[PDB]
Amino acid sequence: VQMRTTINNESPLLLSPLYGNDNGNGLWWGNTLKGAWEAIPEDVKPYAAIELHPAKVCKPTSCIPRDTKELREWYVKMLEEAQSLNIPVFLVIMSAGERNTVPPEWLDEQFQKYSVLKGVLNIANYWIYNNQLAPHSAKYLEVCAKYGAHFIWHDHEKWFWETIMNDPTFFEASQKYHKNLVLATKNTPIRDDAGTDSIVSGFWLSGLCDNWGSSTDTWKWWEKHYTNTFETGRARDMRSYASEPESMIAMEMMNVYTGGGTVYNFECAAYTFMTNDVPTPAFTKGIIPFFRHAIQNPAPSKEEVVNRTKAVFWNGEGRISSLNGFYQGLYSNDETMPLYNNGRYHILPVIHEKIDKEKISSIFPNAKILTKNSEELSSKVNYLNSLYPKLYEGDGYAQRVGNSWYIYNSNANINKNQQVMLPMYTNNTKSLSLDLTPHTYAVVKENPNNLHILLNNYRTDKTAMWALSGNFDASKSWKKEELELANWISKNYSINPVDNDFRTTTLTLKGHHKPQINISGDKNHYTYTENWDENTHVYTITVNHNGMVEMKI
Ligand SMILES: CC(=O)N[C@@H]1[C@@H](O[C@@H]2O[C@@H](C)[C@@H](O)[C@@H](O)[C@@H]2O)[C@H](O[C@@H]2O[C@H](CO)[C@H](O)[C@H](O)[C@H]2O[C@@H]2O[C@@H](C)[C@@H](O)[C@@H](O)[C@@H]2O)[C@@H](CO)O[C@H]1O
Secondary structure, three states: OOOOOOOEOOEOEEEEEEEEOOOOOOEOOOOOHHHHHHOOOOOOHHHEEEEEEOHHHOOOOOOOOOOOHHHHHHHHHHHHHHHHOOOOEEEEEEEOOOOOOOOHHHHHHHHHHOOOEEEEEEEOOOOOOOOOHHHHHHHHHHHHHHOOOEEEEEOOOHHHHHHHHOOHHHHHHHHHHHHHEEEEEEOOOOOOHHHHHHHHHHHHHOOOOOEEEEEEEOOHHHHOOOOOOOOOOOOOOHHHHHOOOHHHHHHHHHHHHOOOOOEEEEEOHHHHOEEOOEEOHHHHHHHHHHHHHHHHOOOOOHHHHHHHOOEEEEOEOEOHHHOOOOOOOOOOOOOOOOOOOOOOOOOOOEEOOOOOHHHHHHHOOOOEEEOOOOHHHHHHHHHHHOOOOOOOEEOOEEEEEOOEEEEEOOOOOOOOOEEEEEEOOOOOOOEEEEEEOOOOEEEEEEOOOOEEEEEEOOOOOOHHHHOOOOOOOHHHOOOHHHHHHHHHHHHOOOOOOOOOOOEEEEEEEEOOOOOOOEEEEOOOOEEEEEEEEOOOOEEEEEEEEOOEEEEEO
16 A cells, blocks of 8 residues: 655655634634645645644534534535645544544545545643543554554653553554654643653654654743743733744754654644735744755654664663653753753653663664663763763754754743854864854755855744734633734734844854855845955854845855
8 A cells, every 4th residue: 555645854744734613614713725725835735734623613622523423524524625626634533632533434434535635633632641542543543554644643741652652552553553653742731842852753763653743832832921022021812822933933843853853733823824814924934944944955864863872761760751850961951841952962862661672772783771770870961971972162052963063042032142163074164153143043064065054033023913902811712812813913914024123143164265155045134244354264244134044155
């Protein structure tokens, strides 16, 4: 049987979601299925699909997909529409602990009838676990395998993912149907961000799923009580989901990309995608440009991630969920938030207890296997620092990935610059330094005879949205105040983005022949000054921008 979707490092997947309305044309936020697909640029379409979440169609509770006549109707309606239009779709069929979801038999028939049906999703259960979720997912996975489809599970937290793969049924099914399984994060609940990345990517490395990825959720900004960028002392509301910086969304994608991840999904869609069929700047200027990077430059393969791995942590003698300060002093000071401070260790993989130590030895023959009882954990940093050499100076985030540097400012909501000094691996230049404002990422690729630099610091000013009168409390989600916000978005944010405030990225090449540069970027959204020191051979470019800037040097 041929797969319905090709998903790997050379062929990643972007999911863009649609939400059921129990009313009207059947979809929330003024969106249409046709409008959704039209929003996907043509070069992205071969690597994209639409998620169909029943949402308000679910009864008694919105977004909890209990099997009803009305739910099945809605799935069928949307499938019908998707087919006539040839739009690849995935259905959210599991969510929030629901034990009584659509029968496996029914899904099986939908697969027979619709070649646009590429697979299904289980999303968000960490707060409402029961022992039927893993077995039910296993059964659904088995149906997906029968039809060359994918089962995609977005969930979070260390104890939860440990618990899921400890299930006999799900563990046996993952071992058989890994080709059809995508395990994926969902950092909504502002806990365990590092641990989750380790365990989930760890599953992919252990052969339990052929692909991993993420749901990058801007609701986390609301969970933190954050409001306007850098603002404190204001009450949160739904505008908080519309306030995580655009480029930061891309930085969260970068965490996945550089860890070998391959599937990208997002909430809240009113911010991250589209309202009234008008794509947002977060989508077009945040998510799209980074997904395009992932298309043009395949993510680290499984063998690449394995071969760079100097140590793994194995849950076989005590679990990472019982080590609450493990990532401190390594690469995350704050597991409530997604950004990593250090790229020195990549994502350290965590291997689930169900994987024998001997199997770990054969996946990572040159890796050190750490456990909770490891003597070396009395000097955790010093020990890991003797296996993973220091690669750069400064306080910013940088990771070496093959012949590339992946860089960002790691301050989520604090207006402070970070600097990195990057030794280089070719004689194009001796070192490269960056000064970076918050919400700026960079990719430096060393070719044999040139360097390619991508910069993106796109962040709209959210002040105008925050200045609006009205009630936008989260208790009004799925209600008309949410639509008011969604309408405002399509007339203000999405069409007149307040993105004319530039910020400075400073790029210095030391020991670089006077560089002739080729430069481009987002139209009307950058200026630059060059400076060359004849005697010291230092070349400095000062880029003022709000958006993407690309150079070849
Ligand atoms: C009972 C409870 O309070 N649960 C919340 C989750 O949110 C609520 O429960 C859901 C079943 C929905 O009815 C939702 O409308 C409701 O708020 C919550 O999940 C998400 O959290 C964000 C806030 O951080 C939003 O509320 C968002 O709409 C929720 O996500 C939806 O529901 C999920 C179950 C999935 O289906 C998503 O894909 C949906 O978009 C979590 C977050 O930690 O917290 C629970 O306590």
